[PDB]
Short mmCIF file of C-alpha atoms in Angstrom, two decimals:
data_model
loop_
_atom_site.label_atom_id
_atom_site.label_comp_id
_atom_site.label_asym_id
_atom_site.label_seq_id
_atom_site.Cartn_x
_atom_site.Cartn_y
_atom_site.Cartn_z
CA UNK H 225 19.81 -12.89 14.20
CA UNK H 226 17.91 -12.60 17.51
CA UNK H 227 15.33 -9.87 18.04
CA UNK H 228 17.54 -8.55 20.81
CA UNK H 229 20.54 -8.04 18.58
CA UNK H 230 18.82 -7.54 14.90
CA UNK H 231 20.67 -8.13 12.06
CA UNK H 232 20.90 -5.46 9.33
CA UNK H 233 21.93 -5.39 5.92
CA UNK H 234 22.62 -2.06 3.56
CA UNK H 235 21.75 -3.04 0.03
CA UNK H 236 23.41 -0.99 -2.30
CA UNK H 237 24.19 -0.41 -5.81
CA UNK H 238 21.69 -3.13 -7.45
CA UNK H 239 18.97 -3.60 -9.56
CA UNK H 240 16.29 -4.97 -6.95
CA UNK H 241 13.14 -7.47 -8.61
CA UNK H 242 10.45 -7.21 -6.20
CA UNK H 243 8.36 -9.81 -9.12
CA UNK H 244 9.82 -12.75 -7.07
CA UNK H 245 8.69 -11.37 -3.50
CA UNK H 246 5.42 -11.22 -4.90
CA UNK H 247 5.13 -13.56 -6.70
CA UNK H 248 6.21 -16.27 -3.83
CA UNK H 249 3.67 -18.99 -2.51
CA UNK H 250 4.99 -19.67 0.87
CA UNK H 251 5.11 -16.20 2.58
CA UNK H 252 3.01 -16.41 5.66
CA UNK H 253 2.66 -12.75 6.53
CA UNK H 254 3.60 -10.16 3.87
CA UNK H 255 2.17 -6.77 5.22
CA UNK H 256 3.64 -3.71 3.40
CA UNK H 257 3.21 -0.22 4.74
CA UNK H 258 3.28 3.24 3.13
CA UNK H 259 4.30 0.92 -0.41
CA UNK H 260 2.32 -1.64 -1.98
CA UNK H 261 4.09 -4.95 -3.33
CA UNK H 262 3.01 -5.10 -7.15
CA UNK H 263 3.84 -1.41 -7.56
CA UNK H 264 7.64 -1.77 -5.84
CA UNK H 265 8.69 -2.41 -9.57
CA UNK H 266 7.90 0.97 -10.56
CA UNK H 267 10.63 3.16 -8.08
CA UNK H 268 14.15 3.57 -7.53
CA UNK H 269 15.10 3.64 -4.05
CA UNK H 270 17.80 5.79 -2.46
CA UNK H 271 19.02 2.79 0.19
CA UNK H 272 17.49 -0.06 1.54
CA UNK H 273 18.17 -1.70 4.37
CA UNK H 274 16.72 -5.02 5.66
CA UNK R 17 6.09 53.11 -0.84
CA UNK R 18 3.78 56.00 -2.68
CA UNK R 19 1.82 53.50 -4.58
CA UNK R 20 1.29 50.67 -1.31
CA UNK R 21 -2.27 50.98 -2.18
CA UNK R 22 -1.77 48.93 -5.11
CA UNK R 23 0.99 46.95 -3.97
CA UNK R 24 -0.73 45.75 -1.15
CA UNK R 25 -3.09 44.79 -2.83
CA UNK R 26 -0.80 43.31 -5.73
CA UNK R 27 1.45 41.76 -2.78
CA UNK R 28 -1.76 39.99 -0.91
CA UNK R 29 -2.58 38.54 -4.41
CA UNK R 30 0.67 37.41 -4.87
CA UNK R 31 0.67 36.46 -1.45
CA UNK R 32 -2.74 34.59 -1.72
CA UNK R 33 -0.92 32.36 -4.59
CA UNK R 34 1.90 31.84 -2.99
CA UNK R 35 0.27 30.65 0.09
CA UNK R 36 -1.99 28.65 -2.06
CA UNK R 37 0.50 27.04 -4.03
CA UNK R 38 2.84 26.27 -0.48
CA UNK R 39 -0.21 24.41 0.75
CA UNK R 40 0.74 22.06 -1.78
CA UNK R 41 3.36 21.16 -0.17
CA UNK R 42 1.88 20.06 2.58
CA UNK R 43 1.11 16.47 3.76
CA UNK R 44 -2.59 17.14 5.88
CA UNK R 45 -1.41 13.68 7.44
CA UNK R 46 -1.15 11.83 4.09
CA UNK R 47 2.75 9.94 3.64
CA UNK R 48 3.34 12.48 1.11
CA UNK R 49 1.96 15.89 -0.50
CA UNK R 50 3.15 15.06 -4.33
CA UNK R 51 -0.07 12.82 -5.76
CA UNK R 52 2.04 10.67 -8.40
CA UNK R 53 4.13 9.27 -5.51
CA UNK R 54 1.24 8.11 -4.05
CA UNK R 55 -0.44 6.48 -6.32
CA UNK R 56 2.80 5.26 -7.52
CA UNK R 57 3.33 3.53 -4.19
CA UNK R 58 -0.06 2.19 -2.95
CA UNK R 59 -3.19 0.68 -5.01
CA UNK R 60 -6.51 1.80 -5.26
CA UNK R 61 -7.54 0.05 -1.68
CA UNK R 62 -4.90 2.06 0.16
CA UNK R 63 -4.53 4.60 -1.89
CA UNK R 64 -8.04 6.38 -1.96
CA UNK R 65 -7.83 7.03 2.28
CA UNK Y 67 -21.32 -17.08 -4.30
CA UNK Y 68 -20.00 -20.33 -2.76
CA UNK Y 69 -16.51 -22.02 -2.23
CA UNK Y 70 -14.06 -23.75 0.21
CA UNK Y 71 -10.72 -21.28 1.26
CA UNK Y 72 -7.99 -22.31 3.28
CA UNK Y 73 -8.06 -21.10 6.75
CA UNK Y 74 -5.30 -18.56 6.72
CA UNK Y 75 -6.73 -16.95 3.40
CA UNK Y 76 -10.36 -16.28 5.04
CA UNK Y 77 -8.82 -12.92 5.55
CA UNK Y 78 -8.46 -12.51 2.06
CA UNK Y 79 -12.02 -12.77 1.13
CA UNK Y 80 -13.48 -9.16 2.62
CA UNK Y 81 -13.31 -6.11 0.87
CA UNK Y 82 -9.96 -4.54 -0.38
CA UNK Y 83 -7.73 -7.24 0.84
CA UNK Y 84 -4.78 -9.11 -0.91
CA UNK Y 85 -3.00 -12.51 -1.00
CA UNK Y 86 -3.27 -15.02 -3.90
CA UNK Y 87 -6.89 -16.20 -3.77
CA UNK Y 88 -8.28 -12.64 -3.36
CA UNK Y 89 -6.34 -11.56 -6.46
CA UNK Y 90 -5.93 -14.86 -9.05
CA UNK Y 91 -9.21 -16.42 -7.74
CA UNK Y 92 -12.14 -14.54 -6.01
CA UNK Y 93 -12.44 -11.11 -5.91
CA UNK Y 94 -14.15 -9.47 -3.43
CA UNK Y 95 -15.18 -5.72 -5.31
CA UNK Y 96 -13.99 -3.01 -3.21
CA UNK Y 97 -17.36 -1.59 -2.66
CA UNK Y 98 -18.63 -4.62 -1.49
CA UNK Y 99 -22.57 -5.00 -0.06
CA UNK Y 100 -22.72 -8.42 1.55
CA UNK Y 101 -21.57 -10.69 4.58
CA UNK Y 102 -18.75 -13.52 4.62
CA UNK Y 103 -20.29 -16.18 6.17
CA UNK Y 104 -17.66 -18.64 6.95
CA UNK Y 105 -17.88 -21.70 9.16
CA UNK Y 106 -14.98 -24.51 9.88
CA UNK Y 107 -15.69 -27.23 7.33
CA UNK Y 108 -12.47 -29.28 8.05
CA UNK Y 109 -14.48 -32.48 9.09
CA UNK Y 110 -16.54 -32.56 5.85
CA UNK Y 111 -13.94 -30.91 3.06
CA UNK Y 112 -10.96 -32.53 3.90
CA UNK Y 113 -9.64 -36.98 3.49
CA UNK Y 114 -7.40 -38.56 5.30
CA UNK Y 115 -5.22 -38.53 1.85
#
């Protein structure tokens, strides 16, 4: 998208591995608040949107 | 009501509990008043403020 | 101690911070008693090739 019009995504009925997030080389920025990356493994989430 | 001496007494115990265990419940400003989600959710750097 | 970081990752090395050199290389311990003295050695660290 544009930052004007954001685009949004509901994902839904998955099982989510947050190892590859992590686990990336190229992220510039990866700031994570309230949650912290290698722990995102451990919950379930109720929705996610991004 | 007869015996309110007691139960008073009996209810501001109960009370004092209840109110005790209710504080529980609340946040004080953290993201969240149950400790396992916490440290379930942010490490030791984060975690400990 | 003494090394040469990358630029972006000189964030990494102060106290309680995270990225791949602060966890899988250098450490920083959380209750950390020291300075970070950092300077821009990218006319004596780094070729051509």
């Amino acid at each position: 998208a544009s930052v004007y019009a954001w685009n949004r995504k509901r994902i839904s009925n998955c099982v989510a591995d947050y190892s590859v997030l992590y686990n990336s080389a190229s992220f510039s920025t990866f700031k994570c608040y309230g949650v912290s990356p290698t722990k995102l493994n451990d919950l379930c989430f109720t929705n996610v949107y991004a | 009501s007869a015996l309110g001496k007691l139960q008073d007494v009996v209810n501001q115990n109960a009370q004092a509990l209840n109110t005790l265990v209710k504080q529980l419940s609340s946040n004080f400003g953290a993201i969240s008043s149950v400790l396992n989600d916490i440290l379930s959710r942010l490490d030791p750097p984060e975690a400990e403020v | 101690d003494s090394f040469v970081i990358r630029g972006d990752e000189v964030r990494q090395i102060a106290p309680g911070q995270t990225g791949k050199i602060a966890d899988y290389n250098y450490k920083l311990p959380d209750d950390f008693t020291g300075c970070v003295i950092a300077w821009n050695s990218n006319n004596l660290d780094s070729k051509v090739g």
